[PDB]
Amino acid sequence: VNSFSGYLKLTDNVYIKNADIVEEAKKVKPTVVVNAANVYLKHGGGVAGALNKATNNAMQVESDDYIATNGPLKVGGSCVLSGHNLAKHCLHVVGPNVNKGEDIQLLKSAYENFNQHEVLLAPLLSAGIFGADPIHSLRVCVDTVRTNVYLAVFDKNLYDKLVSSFL
C-alpha cells in the first residue's frame, strides 16, 4: 500500500491520472520522481522547467555540478540526483526529442531506467515538447516498465484520449 490517490489502473503495475506532476510530488513526497531531462540537464521548459522552478532552481544548481563532473548523459540514459523539496530522489531520464531528430526506438531504453526503482511518479517520456506521440509513449511504458509506475498527465484532453484509446 502506498499514498498515491485517484489513479486509474491500466495494468498490474501501471497507473495513470490527469495531474500536474509538480503538485503531485509536493503532496506525495515519493521516493522517486522522474524528470523529463535532456543530456545537458538544462531544465528550461516542459516538466523539467516546472520541476526545477518548484525547487527554487536548486535542481539546476545541482545538475550543473553533475555535468561539470561527469559530462552529458546519453539519450536513453539517466542519473539519480536529489529530489530536493519534491521527493527523496529525482531520476533524470532522457527520452528522445523528436524535435531534435533523435531515434524514437531509444524510448524503450529510456523507460528501462524505471526498472531500477520499485515505485516511481513519472511523466510520459518523450511527450509534450519532446514531440513524440503520447499514445505510443504510454504503450512503450506499459510494455517496458515492470516496477510500479504512477503516470501524471497534466492535460485533460490527453489524458482522456490516452484512457479511451488504451488497449
Ligand X SMILES: OC[C@H](O)[C@H]1CCCN1c1ncnc2[nH]ccc12
Q: What is the binding site for ligand X (CB under 6 A)?
A: 20-22, 46-47, 50, 123-124, 127-129, 152-155, 158
Confirm or reject binding of residue 36 to Cl ion (CB under 5 A).
yes
Helix runs in the chain, H state only = 21-28, 46-54, 58-70, 106-112, 134-144, 156-164
The SS3 assignment for 165 reads coil
* Sequence-separated (6 or more) residues with CB below 8 Å from residue 128: 36, 46, 47, 134
Decide whether 108 or 161 has the Cβ nearer to ligand X.
Answer: 161
Q: 107 contacts which partner out of Cl ion, ligand X, none, CB within 5 to 8 A by kind? A: none
Residue whose C-beta lies closest to ligand X:
128
Quick note: the x/- pattern for Cl ion over 112-151, rule CB under 5 A, is ----------------xx----------------------
- Cell for 42? 538544462
